[PDB]
Specification:
Number of helices of chain F: 4
Distance between the termini of chain F: 34 Å
Shape of chain A: globular
Number of domains of chain A: 1
GO cellular component, one term (chain E): cytosolic small ribosomal subunit
Chains: A alpha+beta, B mainly alpha, C mainly alpha, D mainly beta, E mainly alpha, F alpha+beta
Number of domains of chain F: 2
CATH superfamily of the largest domain in chain F: Nucleic acid-binding proteins
Strand content of chain A: 5-15%
Organism (chain E): Kluyveromyces lactis (strain ATCC 8585 / CBS 2359 / DSM 70799 / NBRC 1267 / NRRL Y-1140 / WM37) (Yeast)
Oligomer: part of a larger assembly
Distance between the termini of chain A: 32 Å
CATH architecture of the largest domain in chain F: Beta Barrel
CATH topology of the largest domain in chain F: OB fold (Dihydrolipoamide Acetyltransferase, E2P)
Largest sheet of chain F: 5 strands, mixed, barrel
CATH class of chain A: Mainly Alpha
Structural class of chain A: alpha+beta
Number of strands of chain F: 5
Keywords (chain E): Metal-binding, Ribonucleoprotein, Ribosomal protein
CATH topology of chain A: Arc Repressor Mutant, subunit A
Bound molecules: magnesium ion
InterPro entries (chain E): Ribosomal_eS19, Ribosomal_eS19_CS, WH-like_DNA-bd_sf, WH_DNA-bd_sf
Order of helices and strands of chain A: HEHHEE
Protein name (chain E): S16a
Strand content of chain F: 15-25%
Radius of gyration of chain A: 11 Å
Helix content of chain F: 25-40%
Amino acid sequence: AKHAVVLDQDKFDRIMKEAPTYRYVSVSVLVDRFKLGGSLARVALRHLENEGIIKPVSKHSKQAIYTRAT
Amino acid sequence: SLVVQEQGSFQHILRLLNTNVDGNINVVYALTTIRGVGRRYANLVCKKADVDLHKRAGELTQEELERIVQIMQNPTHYKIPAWFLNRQKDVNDGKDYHSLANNLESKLRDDLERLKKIRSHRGIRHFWGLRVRGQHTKTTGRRRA
Amino acid sequence: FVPVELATTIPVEIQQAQQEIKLFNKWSFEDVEVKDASLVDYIQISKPIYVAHTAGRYANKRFRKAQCPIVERLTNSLMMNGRNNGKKLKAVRIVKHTLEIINVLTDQNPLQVVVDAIINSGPREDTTRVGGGGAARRQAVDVSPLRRVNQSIALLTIGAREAAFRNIKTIAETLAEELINAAKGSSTSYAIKKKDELERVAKSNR
Amino acid sequence: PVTLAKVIKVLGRTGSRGGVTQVRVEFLEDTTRTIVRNVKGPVREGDILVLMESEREARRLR
Amino acid sequence: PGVSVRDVPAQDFINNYASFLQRQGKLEVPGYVDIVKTSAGNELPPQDSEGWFYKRAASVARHIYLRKQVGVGKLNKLYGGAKNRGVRPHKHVDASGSINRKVLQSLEKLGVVEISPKGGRRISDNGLRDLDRIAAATLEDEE
Amino acid sequence: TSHCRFYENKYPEIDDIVMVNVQQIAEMGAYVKLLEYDNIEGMILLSELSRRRIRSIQKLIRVGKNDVAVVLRVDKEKGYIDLSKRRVSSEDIIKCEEKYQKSKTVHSILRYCAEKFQIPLEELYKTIAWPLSRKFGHAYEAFKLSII
RNA sequence: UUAAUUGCGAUAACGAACGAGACCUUAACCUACUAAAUAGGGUUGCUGGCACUUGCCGGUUGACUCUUCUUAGAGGGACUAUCGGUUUCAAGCCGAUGGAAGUUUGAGGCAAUAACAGGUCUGUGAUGCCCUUAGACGUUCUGGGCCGCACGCGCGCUACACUGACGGAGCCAGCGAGUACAACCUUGGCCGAGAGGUCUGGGUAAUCUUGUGAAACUCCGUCGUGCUGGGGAUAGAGCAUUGUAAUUAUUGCUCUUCAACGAGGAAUUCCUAGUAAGCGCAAGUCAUCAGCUUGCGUUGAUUACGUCCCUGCCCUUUGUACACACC
RNA sequence: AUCUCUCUCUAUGCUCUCUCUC
Ligand SMILES: [Mg+2]
Ligand SMILES: [Mg+2]
Ligand SMILES: [Mg+2]
Ligand SMILES: [Mg+2]
Ligand SMILES: [Mg+2]
Ligand SMILES: [Mg+2]
Ligand SMILES: [Mg+2]
Ligand SMILES: [Mg+2]
Ligand SMILES: [Mg+2]
Ligand SMILES: [Mg+2]
Ligand SMILES: [Mg+2]
Ligand SMILES: [Mg+2]
């Protein structure tokens, strides 16, 4: 990945609007669909999960299993 | 954990202590790129400074960087004893020093020169281009110069 | 459903009809749809194992290998290449994650999807180095069911392995994706492609 | 094109390397045919065997 | 009906205890907190600056509660692990010997861990009470 | 990422002459990259690699090197190439080589521009190489005509 | 037929003897027997804690009671048993049931005849013979040397990273081995940031070290496609330790130094179930040092159950201008 | 009367020798 380890405002907005429609949400997924690549993606995911937005399925760390609200 | 998005304030790729410090490596691990600076001790330095490790390379404000530099170059005053730094005890001053960037190599060179002058075994080996620290050259070191 | 009163603390899920119906760690071991005719006692299903981790004897008879749960077999196959020889717990965890991914993406009971993938990857026509003097001659030989299934499983695992070798994608997700591809939709997964190539090769030879 | 036939009896095992089985295949669609087929791998009696090959058959493997 | 230390999950409990310790004023920290690697069999010191030694203390307390006659050496053996000798296969090396001792001393000062006239350290009644309280808190957090 | 096929359409045709750079040997033959058509993976099944029995595999074919080839089986759905080396006739070989060279030259032309300005590669391919090909047959011929 | 010159049987052969098998040694099964502060329970005292109405979790050499686990000892157990078919229905085999177990139950240990011109006089006071025998090839002291390095092979280890690494925090093993006419394994309490010191005791043994709280693993993190926190070679500099003696780093520990190395050509080894591999540990050597062996034990796959194609082997027949026997 | 039917290169090699007592 060509850097892309920034919690940029535009990037955040994109994430907000692209995490729905798609059923599966993960760090790997984010990396694939070109936004954040690596460590700060996890942080972003965490801060999307305060109340609602994306619902958890995983009860496990390292691999994240998350589905948007239907 | 940080929810802060941050605007255009951090400038990536920094020129610190002459040697180029690269972008978005985790402060400690950004400092490691500089010679003389190494992992654990970098971390310790950071801790001493009182900057949070979970930050970007460009994130660091100038003052913090300055403090870090000070900690590195003058180590003894900020509670860093012997089992800590590069040239412990030393051969030239008696005081211990945490040599950096373009100093350690120079010191090494000086040592080599002295050895050569005084024709010691290690020095001889170095002159030759041979393995010093207990190795059997029956197999060891076929890469050459 | 029906809370059993104990001095020891037991979770609600356990109390509920999991005592009544014994299907998986909260997944359907029912449905039961094998697309090809019969194929049972070669792809196991039926026996509702809770967690894909059973210590038994599945090498000590000719066909007894079949009575391994398919998920368990998958886990075992995943358990491969230096860094991961032994450590079946890890494999089990990965399988669980894969299942979760499947559930998330394109819904359905994941077990059925897995079964479909197993069916639709594996080859009908195969090649053996018969020789003809030891040279490059390979007669087209049709494959036995159990063996074919095993091969398919192996190739699925291989695909995942290939994907994971220096990548952001954690093994499980990748595996799930490839499984889905194999089942039906795109058929751009590695394993399925390989199988098809093999079949083609077999066809052009006798 | 898709065909499938049940196995009933094994006509031994043949091959320079070996391992590859000679089988007697009976078609579940019309039981009038019992053909000599090459099968790779572990195979017993009463198994459904998918065949991409329709009519071609061989006995010995050399 | 009630609670004890054995019946409550490990890591969560430990973290709760650590949090409690942090909240509390008395701890008696060394002059070398997060300067040591906690193990000579370890390569890099602990992360997230503040605490971690607290966590270790909590863990030690838990261990003491579980057993009866545990000394410094045994605790050291318990912690640490495989030291990356690099090119040479990794042998099991014990933790940093003094750190555990310091932790024990701190606990003694707080009044949670005492000594038995057989050899080693055992739990104090106050300590037991504290542990029980922590367990209760953890239970509350869960449900 | 840099990609896109050598010719006009996405997928290769039956009995198309190609040049194959050898990647790695497996079981069927080799998973080669076709240098006359994109970089789509295909295989030479062990029967049609050479005219005669030559015993050695790493002297007449060779890993890393290019081989004069022809496409036998193509499946216009996803991506499979059943390939031959033997079915290439005497002579013919020279022609194939020439074609390969032409293709290489074409490829060389289309990258400098990209380097100078990024922008989508597919678009570039569309606006430089394809219409001419459609009009005649090959891009190198068109280039030659232009030069003349 | 069988792993088997293992059987059954045809029978100028009959009755044999080794060998195999049996046999030992252990590993599994014995809620059967004998038993047990040097092995664990059980109830109750004696208390500690939280619920409190009984209770749960412990501590304590308090009694007393046993013995399922831990130890052993006598013994027993499976013999292919029971059917199902197949086979001159004999020899046996594959499948099913029951069983702790049905591959000779797994693995060993002993291993025949005949040799090899295999290996060693560098295990010996096991020696023939030849030599040197007093400035000695005997002997010991001092110091090197076997550890040298343009290279070429053979073992092994670490890696080439996300199933990762790095932090925490979970927490679980079996073989051992260990003190006297010497200086062992070392606990527990204070030193040091590690290594390692130090006063003490326990243990010349199921007790003490040691439940060897072992790794790998397990959970919460941190890092995130990068020769990059992957790799730790090579170099510096310093603190201890063993030893009369560490330079040609003995080793250990702290530091900094960060190369080759993106899963490996042609080639070839090893393996068919607690096996392969991963992972440790102890022992042997040992004053100090394991990347080594030898034994354990954790974690535990994939694919065969077959053929003679390559590589051998076994017998039978066959052909040999070969017996130094196809080299 | 029941067979069924497989396949190719591969060159050479120099270091002895042995009986007893009836
Ligand atoms: Mg019977
Ligand atoms: Mg035996
Ligand atoms: Mg002699
Ligand atoms: Mg002399
Ligand atoms: Mg030597
Ligand atoms: Mg060896
Ligand atoms: Mg490291
Ligand atoms: Mg590693
Ligand atoms: Mg034990
Ligand atoms: Mg690095
Ligand atoms: Mg030595
Ligand atoms: Mg000859």
